[PDB]
Each structure stands twice: as structure tokens, then as C-alpha cells.
Design a protein around this ligand. Structure first.
Ligand SMILES: Nc1ncnc2c1ncn2[C@@H]1O[C@H](COP(=O)(O)O)[C@@H](O)[C@H]1O
Ligand SMILES: [Mg+2]
Length: 567
């Protein structure tokens, strides 16, 4: 299996070797099973959709995938791989919402197709024609007769061929289309398997959205890569009842599952003690966390809350990656049992230095060891000189999982994918800040969101965490710290949602005062302004990540949903 050059050859092999083994079971409500596919049926379905795509002249073209989470999305995605159609997964449109994000992906990808379900096609086909013209074709894939797979013409696929476009979330700017090759997919799956060490006997569960790297490469393709069985549920099933994720782990004796940091906080806060009595989590051997800062207190709160259910903190598997690196770059605790943590000087961090406090301290969790044959360097982002040990700079990645570039952005591709430092060339510039310590990669934040105020660096996630706990009226996870120019000087602005229960009785002056006090004590900063906004209204990506740059744009133009302001 490690001799396959692409996922088409690999799925065809599993379809022969494990034809009747279930590959995916879908729990539509996160509880009761509602559909399933064997390896044999998955391959037959992919061939039938492939043949349907080729007859419709999609080969060599870009095609949006507009599906609910479920098995139809998976068939359409592999169907694109089988047919040679450049798939473009995206969040489906939702009722009473604008198609701005979808049109823009369509515009950027220069896509001539949208692949979807029969139900969705009937609601969006005429709107897509209004936006995209008559030469755009919206096709339904869920009613393709399986016999049509007999007409599939298997393309000559080499590793260097483009497999699909993975669009970034839009956190720091417009979503950019990452050109992911067939070889990227194979190489990274091997890297994931080096770190997780799953086998055919592994069992997984995932609630992650299938449209983006973690849920796609990890939740869909890695089970196929190792020959395992994967249980799936929609993200909305877990977010509305977090117990279902941990109950599924218990019921199927899942060995491998994971999620971003906030999901472990959600489980710790929303699962009752009696619900914990129903869990046996001693089988949960690898609990991965990535896609966001890994917080030491989150790990500890989760480990303590679920200790009586048999969760061991040594199962935590921190990891780091991005769409531009296909998925994973680093993961694991190295030789230690628990995730490595360091206690360093906060003021040092603000000055790009890693050192003990000799001042206040911050605790940072490492995001793993670099996996496999890839190379990671920490580089000064202006001088392009390699940092020495103890110095924070930009994370640069060189390896076979580094994507081919950004779709139709030749200037930006050259800037970010052709990084030169010292006598080195060909590095990917991640746009993340961090450092190396003890073989672990630590990530401190995003370069594009970094705040430089009064001659000092400040990480906005640090300020946002200080603000959200300053008063009961502020909703956790729904704030942004940005800087704005005031007479040529950068100054801090806070955009923060208030809770629904406090929106009608909000004492703006008292809560603003609490926020100013928290920021002064922890960060020695004075906000230029505090903007209180309605619950649910902060600029976010489809996955729910805050768009800090759009918070700044809305503050400066007066388009936020304001309930109160301090200035
Ligand atoms: N372990 C981690 N620690 C901190 N930030 C992370 C981590 N993993 C991923 N991220 C963030 O998520 C970004 C990639 O997002 P995406 O391309 O959507 O996977 C990275 O560039 C980081 O900014
Ligand atoms: Mg990014």
C-alpha cells in the first residue's frame, strides 16, 4: 500500500482486498446510524459518479461540491478524483443567506460546474444561473445509476497532477485556492500515518466538517489510506449536544478522534456528571488537537473532567498544519508521555525571545515534532535570516506535502512558496510565528494578525482571552483585538459580542471599565475604543473562525451590529 501513487489506485486496491468491510457509517443525528458504505460500494459509487462527470465534459475543469455532511459528499469527492475533475469542496448554501462567498469561490476557481444533491439543485440552480450565466452547469450526483460506472475511462494520473483546490478559510483575507496534487495527498497521508500509527483494526469517529483539510484529509482520506472504519456525524450534531461525540467514542471503542481546542472546552462545560458515568474512554488512545492554539488549561480541564471516565491525558496528540502544507506538519509529544509545555517570560515573547522569567509568565503547549522527511526552519520575516535558538520568527516548511501554489495567483505563489533563507531555497512561508524548543514546534500566532502598538508586539488571541473573562456580559470566543491608525499611531480597538441575556440591560460604562482594567493589568495597553456587538454578528468564516481584519473594516465603516460603544 505504500507503493500507490494516488488515491484512485489505492481505493481500487482496497475495494478488492476489503470489499465487504464498512468504510464509513453516517449518524445523521450523531446517535442513530442512518447510512453506510463498504469499500466495495464506495469504489462502485466513485466509478459511477466519475463516468457521469466525464460524459458531462467536467474532466480537467473545476467543480464546486455543495453537499450536506454525509456519504454523498464523499462519493462526489472521490468521483472527482476518479474522473480527473478538480474538485472544489465548499460549505453548501443555507436558506435566507447570500451566495457572496460561493460566487467568489466560483469566480476565483473559474469553475464551470457545481456538484450537489437533487434537493439542493432544485433550490439553487436558477440562482446559480442568475449569478454565473447559462454556461455554468449545476449537476446532481445522488441519482446516478451505478451501472453507468461501466463507462468510466480511468485517466492516466501521475502524482504531479492537480487533484483538487483546497480553499483557505478566509481568516486573514479572501479565501485562496491551494493547489493540492495527487502526490501531496499520498505524501501527507503517509505523514499522518507515521504520527497516528493507525492500522486496519483502528476505529475512528469524526464530527468535523468534511469540506476543509482536517475533516477532509484526516476524517475522509486517512481511514481509506489505512484500511480502517470511520464513523461520521455532522458538526451540528456535536455542537448542539457535545455528549454525542464522547458517547460515540464509547459505543464503537474508538481509538482515534480529535478536534480543535474549543471542542475540548465544550465537552468539559456541557457534559453532565451523570453523562460521564455512561462513558468508558480507556480505548481513546489518540486524541488529537489542532487548527487553533492548544491551551494548557483546556487540556488540564478536559483531563480532569473525564478522568473518572478513563480518559488519560497521555492520549492528547497536539498537531500543527495548514491547507498549504496539505494537512499535517508536526504532531505528538515526542519521547514524553504528556504534551510538552514550557513556562516562559511573557515580556520576552512580546520581544520575539523565548526565555525564563527573571516579570510574568505564559504557558505554551508544543504542537509536536516535525514528522518524517520534511524540514522546518524559523526565519526572521523581514531580514530572511534564520533565527538562532531562543528566537521567535516565521515558520517555514519545506517538503513533498507543500502544495503546488495558489490557484491563479502567480505573484503571491512566488512570494509565499519560493522562500529563500541563507543558502536554502524553496520554502513555504506559513504566515505563522513560532520557535523550536527541544524538538517541538511551538506556534505563537499569525503574523498578519499580530498587533504592534507603542513599540511592542502583542498577540490578539492573548488580548481576546483577557477581555472575554473580564465581565459576565461578554460571550466567550466571539471577540477580536485589532489595531487602528490614530494620527499615524497604531492603537488598540476591541470588538466584542455581548451575551443574549445581557443585551437588553447592558451597562456599557461598567463593562467597558472592567475590560480596560483587565487589559491594563495583563498587557499594559489602553484601548482606543470598545465596540459591543450583537450575539452572533461578529465577522466569521464558514467554520466559525473570527475574521479580525473584517472586524477592523466594519468598525471603521460603521457596519457592525452595535449594541454599545466606549471611546
Ligand atoms: N497547533 C496549532 N497552534 C496554533 N495555531 C494553529 C495550529 N494548527 C493550526 N493553526 C492555525 O490554523 C492555520 C491553518 O488553517 P487551515 O489552513 O484552515 O488549516 C495555521 O496557519 C495556524 O494559524
Ligand atoms: Mg491561512
Amino acid at each position: 500500500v505504500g507503493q500507490f501513487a494516488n488515491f484512485v489506485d489505492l481505493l481500487q486496491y482496497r475495494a478488492k482486498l476489503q470489499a465487504r468491510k464498512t468504510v464509513f457509517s453516517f449518524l445523521a443525528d450523531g446517535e442513530a446510524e442512518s447510512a453506510a458504505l463498504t469499500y466495495g460500494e464506495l469504489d462502485q459509487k466513485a466509478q459511477a459518479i466519475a463516468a457521469f462527470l466525464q460524459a458531462n465534459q467536467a474532466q480537467g475543469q473545476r467543480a464546486l461540491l455543495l453537499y450536506p455532511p454525509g456519504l454523498e459528499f464523499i462519493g462526489a469527492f472521490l468521483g472527482c478524483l476518479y474522473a480527473g475533475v478538480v474538485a472544489v469542496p465548499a460549505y453548501p448554501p443555507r436558506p435566507n443567506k447570500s451566495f457572496d462567498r460561493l460566487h467568489s469561490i466560483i469566480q476565483d476557481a473559474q469553475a464551470k460546474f457545481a456538484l450537489t444533491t437533487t434537493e439542493l439543485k432544485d433550490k439553487i440552480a436558477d440562482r446559480l444561473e442568475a449569478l454565473e450565466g447559462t454556461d455554468f452547469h449545476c449537476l446532481a450526483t445522488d441519482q446516478v445509476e451505478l451501472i453507468s460506472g461501466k463507462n468510466w475511462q480511468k485517466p492516466n494520473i501521475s502524482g504531479t497532477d492537480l487533484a483538487f483546490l483546497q480553499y483557505t478559510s478566509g481568516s486573514t483575507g479572501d479565501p485562496k485556492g491551494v493547489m493540492v496534487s495527487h502526490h501531496n495527498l499520498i505524501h501527507n497521508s503517509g505523514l499522518i500515518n507515521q504520527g497516528f500509527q493507525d492500522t486496519e483494526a483502528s476505529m475512528g469517529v469524526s464530527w468535523l466538517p468534511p469540506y476543509h483539510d482536517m475533516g477532509l484529509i484526516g476524517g475522509i482520506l486517512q481511514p481509506i489510506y489505512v484500511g480502517a472504519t470511520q464513523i461520521l456525524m455532522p458538526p451540528v450534531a456535536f455542537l448542539q449536544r457535545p455528549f454525542r461525540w464522547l458517547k460515540a467514542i464509547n459505543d464503537y471503542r474508538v481509538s482515534t478522534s480529535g478536534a480543535p481546542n474549543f471542542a475540548y472546552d465544550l465537552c468539559a462545560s456541557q457534559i453532565t456528571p451523570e453523562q460521564i458515568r455512561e462513558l468508558d474512554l480507556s480505548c481513546w488512545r489518540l486524541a488529537f488537537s489542532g487548527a487553533e492554539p492548544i491551551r494548557a488549561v483546556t487540556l488540564e480541564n478536559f483531563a480532569k473532567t473525564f478522568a473518572t471516565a478513563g480518559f488519560q491525558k497521555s492520549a492528547f496528540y497536539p498537531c500543527y498544519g495548514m491547507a498549504e502544507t496539505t494537512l499535517i506538519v508536526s504532531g505528538g509529544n515526542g519521547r514524553a508521555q504528556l504534551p510538552q509545555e514550557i513556562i516562559v517570560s511573557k515580556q520576552g515573547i512580546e520581544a520575539n525571545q523565548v526565555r525564563p522569567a527573571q516579570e510574568t509568565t505564559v504557558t505554551l503547549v508544543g504542537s509536536g515534532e516535525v514528522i518524517g522527511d520534511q524540514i522546518v526552519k524559523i526565519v526572521d520575516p523581514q531580514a530572511l535570516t534564520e533565527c538562532t535558538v531562543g528566537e521567535i520568527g516565521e515558520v517555514w516548511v519545506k517538503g513533498e506535502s507543500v502544495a503546488q501554489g495558489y490557484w491563479q495567483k502567480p505573484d503571491l505563489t512566488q512570494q509565499q512558496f519560493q522562500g529563500n533563507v541563507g543558502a536554502e531555497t524553496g520554502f513555504l512561508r506559513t504566515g505563522d510565528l513560532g520557535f523550536l524548543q527541544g524538538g517541538e514546534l511551538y506556534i505563537t500566532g499569525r503574523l498578519k494578525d499580530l498587533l504592534i502598538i507603542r513599540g511592542r508586539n502583542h498577540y490578539p488571541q492573548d488580548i481576546e482571552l483577557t477581555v472575554e473573562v473580564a465581565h459576565p456580559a461578554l460571550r466567550q470566543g466571539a471577540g477580536a483585538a485589532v489595531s487602528v491608525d490614530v494620527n499615524g499611531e497604531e492603537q488598540l480597538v476591541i470588538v466584542q459580542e455581548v451575551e443574549r441575556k445581557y443585551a437588553r440591560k447592558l451597562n456599557v460604562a461598567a463593562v467597558a471599565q472592567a475590560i480596560r482594567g483587565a487589559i491594563a493589568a495583563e498587557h499594559q495597553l489602553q484601548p482606543q475604543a470598545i465596540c459591543f456587538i450583537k450575539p452572533g454578528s461578529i465577522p466569521k468564516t464558514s467554520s466559525g473562525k473570527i475574521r479580525r481584519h473584517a472586524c477592523k473594516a466594519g468598525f471603521l465603516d460603521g457596519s457592525l451590529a452595535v449594541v454599545g460603544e466606549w471611546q
